[PDB]
Amino acid sequence: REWKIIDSTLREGEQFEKANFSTQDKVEIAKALDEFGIEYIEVTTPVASPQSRKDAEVLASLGLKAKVVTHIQCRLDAAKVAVETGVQGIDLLFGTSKYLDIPRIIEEAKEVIAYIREAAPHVEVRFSAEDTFRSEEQDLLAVYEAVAPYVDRVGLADTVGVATPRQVYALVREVRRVVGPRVDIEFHGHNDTGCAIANAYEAIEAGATHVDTTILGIGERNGITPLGGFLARMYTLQPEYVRRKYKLEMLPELDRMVARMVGVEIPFNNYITGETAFSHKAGMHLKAIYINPEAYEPYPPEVFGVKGLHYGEEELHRVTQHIKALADRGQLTLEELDRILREWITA
Amino acid sequence: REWKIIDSTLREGEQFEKANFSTQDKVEIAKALDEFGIEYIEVTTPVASPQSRKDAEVLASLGLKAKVVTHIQCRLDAAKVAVETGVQGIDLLFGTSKYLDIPRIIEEAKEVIAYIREAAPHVEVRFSAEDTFRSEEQDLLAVYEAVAPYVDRVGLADTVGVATPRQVYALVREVRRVVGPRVDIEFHGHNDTGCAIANAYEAIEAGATHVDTTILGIGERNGITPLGGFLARMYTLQPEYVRRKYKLEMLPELDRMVARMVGVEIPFNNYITGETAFSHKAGMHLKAIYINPEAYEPYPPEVFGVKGLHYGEEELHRVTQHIKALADRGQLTLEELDRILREWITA
Numbered sequence: 001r002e003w004k005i006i007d008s009t010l011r012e013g014e015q016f017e018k019a020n021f022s023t024q025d026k027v028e029i030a031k032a033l034d035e036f037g038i039e040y041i042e043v044t045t046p047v048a049s050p051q052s053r054k055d056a057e058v059l060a061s062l063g064l065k066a067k068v069v070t071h072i073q074c075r076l077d078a079a080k081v082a083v084e085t086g087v088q089g090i091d092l093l094f095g096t097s098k099y100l101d102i103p104r105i106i107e108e109a110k111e112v113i114a115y116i117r118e119a120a121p122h123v124e125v126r127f128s129a130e131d132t133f134r135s136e137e138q139d140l141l142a143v144y145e146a147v148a149p150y151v152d153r154v155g156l157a158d159t160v161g162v163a164t165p166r167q168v169y170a171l172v173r174e175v176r177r178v179v180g181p182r183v184d185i186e187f188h189g190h191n192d193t194g195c196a197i198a199n200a201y202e203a204i205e206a207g208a209t210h211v212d213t214t215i216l217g218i219g220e221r222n223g224i225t226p227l228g229g230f231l232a233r234m235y236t237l238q239p240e241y242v243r244r245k246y247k248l249e250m251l252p253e254l255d256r257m258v259a260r261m262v263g264v265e266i267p268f269n270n271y272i273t274g275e276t277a278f279s280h281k282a283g284m285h286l287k288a289i290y291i292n293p294e295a296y297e298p299y300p301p302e303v304f305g306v307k308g309l310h311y312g313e314e315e316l317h318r319v320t321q322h323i324k325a326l327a328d329r330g331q332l333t334l335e336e337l338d339r340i341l342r343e344w345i346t347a
Numbered sequence: 348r349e350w351k352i353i354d355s356t357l358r359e360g361e362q363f364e365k366a367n368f369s370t371q372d373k374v375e376i377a378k379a380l381d382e383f384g385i386e387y388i389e390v391t392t393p394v395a396s397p398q399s400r401k402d403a404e405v406l407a408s409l410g411l412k413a414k415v416v417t418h419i420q421c422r423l424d425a426a427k428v429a430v431e432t433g434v435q436g437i438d439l440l441f442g443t444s445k446y447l448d449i450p451r452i453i454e455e456a457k458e459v460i461a462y463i464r465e466a467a468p469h470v471e472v473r474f475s476a477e478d479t480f481r482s483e484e485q486d487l488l489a490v491y492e493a494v495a496p497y498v499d500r501v502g503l504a505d506t507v508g509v510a511t512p513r514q515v516y517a518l519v520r521e522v523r524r525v526v527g528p529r530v531d532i533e534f535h536g537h538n539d540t541g542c543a544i545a546n547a548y549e550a551i552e553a554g555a556t557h558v559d560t561t562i563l564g565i566g567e568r569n570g571i572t573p574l575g576g577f578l579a580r581m582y583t584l585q586p587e588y589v590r591r592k593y594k595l596e597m598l599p600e601l602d603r604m605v606a607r608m609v610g611v612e613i614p615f616n617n618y619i620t621g622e623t624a625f626s627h628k629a630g631m632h633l634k635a636i637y638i639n640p641e642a643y644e645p646y647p648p649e650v651f652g653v654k655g656l657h658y659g660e661e662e663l664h665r666v667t668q669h670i671k672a673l674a675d676r677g678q679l680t681l682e683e684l685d686r687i688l689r690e691w692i693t694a
């Protein structure tokens with residue numbers, strides 16, 4: 001299974017009690033996420049406020065590799081503002097939750113999608129359900145199946161943080177059946193019941209292609225799938241893939257940056273970067289206690305920076321230039337060379 | 348599904364880097380867990396060290412309601428020491444992990460079980476696999492099925508913290524098939540891939556009856572299923588059951604007690620008791636952002652203390668005496684009256 005991350009530090013993260021990111025803070029965060037290799041960066045909807053709009057505009061025009069995306073309600077005026085910011089993708093939200101008129105939902109959606117398709121044909125269109133896991137699946141599938149021919153991606157969002165891993169798996173398989181071969185599936189999961197990482201994993205197991213994370217899991221309440229924890233989960237299953245696509249050794253810089261900005265300490269037990277993530281009580285690994293004589297190690301700390309014509313000339317040019325650039329910055333490490341070259345040499 | 352908690356703060360928690368509990372600390376912890384309503388309290392094997400043995404003896408003879416249990420390797424000399432401490436249950440460990448002679452395992456097990464059955468017939472016998480989720484299931488099931496007629500409970504332990512929720516579910520269903528109607532199933536899960544709570548939940552979904560937790564999830568590395576997080580997960584699914592069986596309003600006292608003893612701060616985002624567990628950025632719940640006009644709430648903070656002959660005379664006697672005792676201590680709250688009386692009045 002292949003998959004991509006949608007970072008939400010500048011969307012979900014702004015809901016975190018202590019977050020108040022300046023435009024400079026956001027640029028710093030986005031540049032670091034881009035260097036890390038994150039594929040998508042979602043920002044708070046530009047219709048939220050003048051500053052949300054200004055920040056979306058700045059971030060979308062930074063020339064990042066990562067695609068800068070946003071979200072809107074199903075309103076033509078919101079769509080208009082979002083397109084104007086220059087974002088590369090727009091997620092349209094709907095809700096059918098028991099805790100909240102399907103024909104209206106579908107019609108308003110198609111109207112807005114039609115507008116975006118015409119005004120900005122290059123922009124990704126996504127369509128997602130707020131409070132997915134308190135909504136009746138037949139209502140969800142009805143809406144997804146109606147909109148799927150016209151969108152690039154559909155989204156499931158466990159807004160309230162109650163979904164169980166096997167519910168996420170089941171519903172993702174159902175959505176895949178209904179949207180067909182082309183349409184991708186994104187998952188956004190809150191952590192109120194301790195399932196955000198497990199749910200993100202199970203969505204991928206079931207065929208989802210995109211997962212939302214934030215650095216340190218910051219977000220509304222106890223937040224969403226944390227970047228570090230999610231990477232740990234995926235690294236144990238696909239280590240070569242994960243280590244190739246992301247600069248895992250910079251994880252501690254990302255955690256520290258955000259911790260400093262929002263004024264928290266990294267949790268004592270935080271995935272990977274927490275003080276005790278790799279340690280145990282000296283003297284307590286006793287043969288009377290454990291069968292295996294070694295203290296177990298799920299992954300190594302250093303991986304996460306913790307103490308006839310011819311073809312291929314374009315890639316050769318890019319690769320050699322990139323390696324040279326790293327060398328001249330004093331940043332050419334064995335980790336970098338591995339991730340740059342493994343796909344060319346090994347088979 | 349009904350189920351019980353095995354607290355492991357005095358077994359798994361002793362592996363936590365910063366833990367060094369005195370005998371007094373352990374008594375304080377065990378008394379608080381007993382008041383909270385935890386069913387089982389597991390202590391480090393008495394064969395580990397003179398102090399482990401002394402502490403097991405003290406805890407097992409405190410007259411707690413909770414059952415004090417321990418673990419051993421499959422050795423007659425270990426079994427002997429464990430029985431002598433007066434513990435009410437003994438878990439025998441085996442390992443078949445790919446990362447570590449089945450006939451030997453089974454024979455040594457039956458020898459030790461036989462000894463315990465004869466020497467202490469009242470003691471619960473449990474039988475558990477170290478590093479369960481890196482072991483071949485056919486090896487596991489072979490051992491479980493051979494020992495099950497003679498034990499009270501079998502255990503699965505994700506020692507290395509790599510199991511996925513659907514693996515836990517599948518293997519638990521398989522174990523249930525093999526051990527039959529009488530034998531219970533316990534689950535112990537590490538959190539290295541962020542799945543400890545989700546895995547504990549899925550084990551229960553599949554038929555498991557016991558789950559290990561520690562306060563704040565302290566333990567080796569980033570620890571195991573945390574008490575608070577697990578209770579949150581279960582409360583959202585079975586709120587009446589959970590609120591009846593445990594004094595949920597004392598959760599903050601338990602988290603604070605352990606945090607103080609081991610010298611950590613409660614994580615900013617800790618389940619229930621963390622600073623931001625219930626909060627969000629003031630002003631950021633915008634109608635432009637969320638469809639639902641209210642900021643979502645998975646459970647209420649106050650629930651967890653966060654800001655012809657006749658029959659039934661014996662229970663009437665116990666209930667009236669208990670309510671009177673609470674009143675005279677100044678501890679008779681509406682929460683207490685609810686959990687004491689709901690099972691008598693409602694139907």
Ligand SMILES: N[C@@H](CCCC[NH3+])C(=O)O
Binds near residue numbers: 128156186188
């Ligand atoms: N924070 C929003 C995210 C929605 C994601 C939709 N792609 C929620 O929890 O509902």
Ligand SMILES: N[C@@H](CCCC[NH3+])C(=O)O
Binds near residue numbers: 359475478507
């Ligand atoms: N801390 C031990 C617990 C074993 C539990 C067996 N009932 C482990 O992770 O393997």
Ligand SMILES: [Co+2]
Binds near residue numbers: 012
């Ligand atoms: Co959210």
Ligand SMILES: [Co+2]
Binds near residue numbers: 506537571
């Ligand atoms: Co353990």
